[PDB]
């Protein structure tokens, strides 16, 4: 590791120390001992600790604050990643292994709010990384383009309900782009946490969205992860939303090779997305429980649920609409993760109905 990087790491560490209002997992778990023992380490593709922690040093309002520039990073900087992963996913020890993929009995899932008084829309997504490619900070412009061609060619063979069109961001009109974002379909541009992780280079080259005509099945290409695979619709019919996702993923997995680790499950750029990579969410109004956003969050956390704003993480609630989803993704099966969202949302609705 070059001396300029060391200097920057030292001031970075000093900055986290003196930030008493910082509550990130990075601040919590990067101790002097941990720091000294990995700060001189470098991965096979030359990623350093600075590449891992820069986002969380620059954005002190980070909740987690680290990313993995390449797959090797998860082991090379294991003394930092391991306790943060344990913490975030609710108990995952050095001796633990993520279980094999298991979608489970789809017929056991239920509709979430048949009267339709609380849930606006239901969404399940997964992420995948292509074998043979590093994560965002180590990609070249040529590689973004290569992966885009591979992925869009594969998706053009989708059939029936999953049949659709790939739309590159390159050449998309500002009007279409902004409309897709406002309608909750397309990822937003210019996320500061991603940008400071060097994860947005060469933007918009290689970035785009595939969707069917109904926009109930969507694929994001080269945003945070190589692929995000999304199923969504209005209402709370979780069984239909999940079924569609399962069908799409199993179909795509038979055509593309995805990185899967014996311990961590499916590999992703952020440690919060490891394992099942699954985030099942509702957009929901809870007039009585959400009177205080802080009380909503305390209830939700007892159900291992996370609260986000209307336009995604790091945004505010607009019109009392929250995004509520399973927090944990690693150390439990796909079926378990979606059940944690299902069960928790059912109970929160019961509490809202009973509340005075
Ligand atoms: N249940 C939902 N219904 C409609 N839109 C949703 C739902 N959950 C998330 N979204 C939208 O997904 C987009 C991405 O949000 P973000 O928090 O980055 O989630 P992720 O990247 O995990 O999919 C945002 O436009 C957000 O409003
Ligand atoms: N898109 C995600 N991976 N979100 C979870 C981490 C987001 C951001 N890096 C933080 O520490 O707050
Ligand atoms: Mg996102």
From Swiss-Prot:
Lineage of the species this protein comes from: Eukaryota, Metazoa, Ecdysozoa, Arthropoda, Chelicerata
GO MF term list: arginine kinase activity; ATP binding; creatine kinase activity
Keyword check for Nucleotide-binding: yes
Consequence of changing residue 314 to D: Reduces catalytic activity by 20%
Protein name: Arginine kinase
GO biological process: phosphocreatine biosynthetic process; phosphorylation
Effect of residue 311 to G: Reduces catalytic activity by 20%
Mutagenesis / variant outcome for changing residue 318 to V: Reduces catalytic activity by 20%
Subcellular location: Cytoplasm
């Amino acid at each position: 590791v070059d001396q300029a990087t060391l200097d920057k790491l030292e001031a970075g560490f000093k900055k986290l120390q003196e930030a008493s209002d910082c509550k990130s997992l990075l601040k919590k778990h990067l101790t002097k001992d941990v720091f000294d023992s990995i700060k001189n380490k470098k991965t096979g593709m030359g990623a350093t600790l600075l590449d891992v922690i820069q986002s969380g040093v620059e954005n002190l309002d980070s909740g987690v604050g680290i990313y993995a520039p390449d797959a090797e990073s998860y082991r090379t900087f294991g003394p930092l990643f391991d306790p943060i992963i344990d913490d975030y996913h609710g108990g995952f020890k050095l001796t633990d292994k993520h279980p094999p993929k298991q979608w489970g009995d789809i017929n056991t899932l239920v509709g979430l709010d048949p009267a339709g008084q609380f849930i606006i829309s239901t969404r399940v997504r997964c992420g995948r990384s292509l074998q043979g490619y590093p994560f965002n900070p180590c990609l070249t412009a040529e590689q973004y383009k290569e992966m885009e061609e591979k992925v869009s060619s594969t998706l053009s063979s989708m059939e029936d309900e999953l049949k659709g069109t790939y739309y590159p961001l390159t050449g998309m009109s500002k009007a279409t782009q902004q409309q897709l974002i406002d309608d909750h379909f397309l990822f937003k541009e210019g996320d500061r946490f991603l940008q400071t992780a060097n994860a947005c280079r060469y933007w918009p080259t290689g970035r785009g969205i595939f969707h069917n005509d109904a926009k109930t099945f969507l694929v994001w290409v080269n945003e945070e992860d190589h692929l995000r695979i999304i199923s969504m619709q209005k209402g709370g019919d979780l069984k239909t939303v999940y079924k569609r996702l399962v069908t799409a993923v199993d179909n795509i997995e038979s055509k593309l090779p995805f990185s899967h680790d014996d311990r961590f499950g499916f590999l992703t750029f952020c440690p919060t997305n490891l394992g099942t990579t699954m985030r099942a969410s509702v957009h929901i109004q809870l007039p009585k429980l959400a009177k205080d956003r802080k009380v909503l969050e305390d209830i939700a956390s007892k159900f291992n649920l996370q609260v986000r704003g209307t336009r995604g993480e790091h945004t505010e609630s607009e019109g009392g609409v929250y995004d509520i989803s399973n927090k944990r993704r690693l150390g439990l099966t796909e079926y378990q993760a979606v059940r944690e969202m299902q069960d928790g949302i059912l109970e929160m609705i019961k509490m809202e109905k009973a509340a005075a």
